[PDB]
Amino acid sequence: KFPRVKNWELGSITYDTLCAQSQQDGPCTPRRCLGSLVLPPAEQLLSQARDFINQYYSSIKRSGSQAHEERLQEVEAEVASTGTYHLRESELVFGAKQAWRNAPRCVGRIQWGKLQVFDARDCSSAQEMFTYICNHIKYATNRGNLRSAITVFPQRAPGRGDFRIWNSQLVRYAGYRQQDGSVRGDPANVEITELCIQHGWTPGNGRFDVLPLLLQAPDEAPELFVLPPELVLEVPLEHPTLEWFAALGLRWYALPAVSNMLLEIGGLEFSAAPFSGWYMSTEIGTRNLCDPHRYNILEDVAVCMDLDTRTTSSLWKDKAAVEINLAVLHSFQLAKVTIVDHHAATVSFMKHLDNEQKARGGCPADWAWIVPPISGSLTPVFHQEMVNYILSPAFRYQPDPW
C-alpha cells in the first residue's frame, strides 16, 4: 500500500504515507512509467473547497472550532448560489505557500514558509496588472538581496476570459529568427518575441534584449508594457582566473519569475499568479548557456580554453561546463546578488525531505528535475529514492493563450 523509500548513500529507509492524500492522477500506469515526460460543477468544487478549508483551520490548530464551522457554511452558501466562492486573504496566503511546498519539481522548497504574497485580486486592467508586476519585481529583487514572492491576480470565472501573462517569465531575452534558419538571442523565446513584434514592439538586435510584457485582461487583446531598465537587475559574467571570459560579453538577469503557471487552491484557479525565488547556478550556467537549443556557448568557451575539441574523450564539454558554472557563481557573488550552487541547494533539499517526513509522512519529488544537470551523482539527491504525486494546492501548466 505504502512505498518504501531508501537512501542508497546512508542505507536509511522511510515509508511515504503522504501520497495516500493524492486526488489527481499522474501519467504512469502499472504497464509503463511515464515519469520522465515534461508535460501531461458544484459537487466537485465543493469537496475541494471543504478539503482545503480543513487544511487551513488544521494549519492554525483551530480545527473543529466555531470559526471553522462558520467558514465551511459561508463557502457552501456561496457555491450553492453562485457556482463559485472566494478566498479570504489569509487562506490565500496559506494556499500559495502550500502550493510551493507541494511542487514536486522544486529543489528550493526548504524556503517554502518564507514567501511574500501580494494579493492582486482587485485588478481590473492590464495597466493595473503592470503596476502590480512592477511592485513585485521591485520587492523581489531588493537590490540583489532576493526575496521570494508571488502576486496573485483575479481567479478564473465561468463567464469570461482569464487574466493572463503571456510571457513565460517576467524577464526573458528576445530570440530573433533569422532568414538563414538560426536564432539570435535566446532560442527558447522565438515565438514570444514574434508575438510582441506583432502586437507592436520595436525590436532590437542584441543577444540580451529584455522583452516587454504582454499582459491580458479578460477578453481583450493583450497589451504591451516595457519594463523600466532600472527594474531589471542583470549580472555581467566574468571568470575569476580566465580574463578572456568577460570578453565573451555574456550576462544574465537576477530574478527568476515564472509567470505562465496556474495556481489551484481549493478548486479555484488563478491563471495569472507570477512567482519568483532566486536561481540555482546550474539553471543559468548549464541549461540556459549550454543547452544546444539555447545560447549553446560550450564550443566557444572550449575553444577559448584551447581544449581539444576533435574528440569527446578529452571531456572538453565537461571541462568547459564547469568553468561556465563557476563564472556564474563568481559573477553573482561579486555583484552581491543571491544565488545558490547545486551542492548547497541539494544539501538543503535533503534537510527539507527530512523535515517533511516528520511533518507530513512524506514529500512529493520528481527525481529527474531535482537531480542537477551536471555532477548528478556528486550530489546527495542522486542517491535518494523519491516518490512523485500530485497534492493540492498546486502549480500546474496551462495552455498558451493564443
Place this chain on the structure above:
Amino acid sequence: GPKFPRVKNWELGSITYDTLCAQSQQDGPCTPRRCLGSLVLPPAEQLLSQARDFINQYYSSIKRSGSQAHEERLQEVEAEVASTGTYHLRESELVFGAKQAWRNAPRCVGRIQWGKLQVFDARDCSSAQEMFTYICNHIKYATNRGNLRSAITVFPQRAPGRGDFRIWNSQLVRYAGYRQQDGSVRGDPANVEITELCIQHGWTPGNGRFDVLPLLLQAPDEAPELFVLPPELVLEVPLEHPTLEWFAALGLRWYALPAVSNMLLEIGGLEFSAAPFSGWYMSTEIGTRNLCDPHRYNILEDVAVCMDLDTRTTSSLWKDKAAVEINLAVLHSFQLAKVTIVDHHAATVSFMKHLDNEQKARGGCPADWAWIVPPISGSLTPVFHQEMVNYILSPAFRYQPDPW
C-alpha cells in the same frame, strides 16, 4: 493523436509514439496515484502462455510466423510441459532469447551493441568445478587481451524441487572490502558482505584496497565452493592522468571486464539463475560512481586536495573539478592500456542512434531515464533531452534474491 505514449526530444523538437509498450506483460511499480520510477528495486498454465509467446517471438524474428515449423514447435512445447511440467529451449532459441533480453533491458545504455553477443551454451554443466572452467573460458574470450567482446554464459535452468545453479558474487571481478576496527572499510565498501562470506567459506584474506575476490560458485543442492581466479586472467588497468603527474602515485586501478553474475535470465517462462554476462565499461561507471560515490572508494576529497582546490566551500565546484579529472584519468589510462572503454558522450550519442533504430524496428524502446542519463554531465549528453517510456518486456534480465 494515437493512444500510445507520445514521446518528445526537447533538443530536436521531434515526436514519436511508443507502440511497443502494448507488448508488455509484466507490471512495473508505478500507478496513476504515484510514480515510483526512481526506486532501484521494484508454475503450470502460466508457463505455457509465457512459452507460447516466446516461441511466436522466435518465429517472427526468423520471418516464419504461421508456418508448420512454428506450429509443430508450439505443439512440441505444449506436449513437453504437459508431461514434465517444464520444457527445454533449442540452441538458436537460447541465442535469440539472450540477445532479446539484452535488447529489452531498460537500464542499459549500451544496447546499440545488442545484436553482437557471443552466447556460450553451458546448459550441460553439472558441477561447481565445471562452472569454474566455463567462467574462465568466458573471461578469457570476453577479455581478449583488452579488445573486449560481449558474451554471456548460460548455465542449467531452474528445475522443480532440485536446487539452483548460483554464482554468489554479484560480479565476476570484485575488490575485497575489509571492515576495520575503527568502523571504516579498506577496499570496496560495496563488497563487505561477499568478502565476509568468502572468508567464512575458507578464503585466506589479504589487506589491500584492490584485492580480487575469489568466486563462490554453487551447483545444485550443494554448499558453494570457492575458486581463486588466476591473476593473468583478470586484466587490470593502473590509473594515471595525462597531465597531472602525481595522479599515478595514488595507486588507483580498475579491472577491465564488467561481468554481472547475479541476475536471473528469464526466457519463455524458463529461469536461468546463473547466466553471467559481460560487456565493456562506460567510463563514468568507474571514474564517477566506483571511485567517487561517498559510500564506495570516496576519493574526491583526496583528489581535490592534490589539485589544491578550495574544499571548504561548495561554491568552488571542487567536487565537479575533481570528478572531471578522475574521469579523464579513467579514459586516458584505458586508451593507453589498449583496453576497450566508452566515454559518456560517445555512449549516449550511440544510444540515441539505437533509439531511432528501435523506433523503426519495434515502435519504441523501454528505457529507464534515471539510469540512462550519466551521473556526471547529464544535460550535456543528448539522452537528457529525450523523454523515455519504461516498461518490462520478456525475455528479460531480472534481479533475484541472494542465495544465502
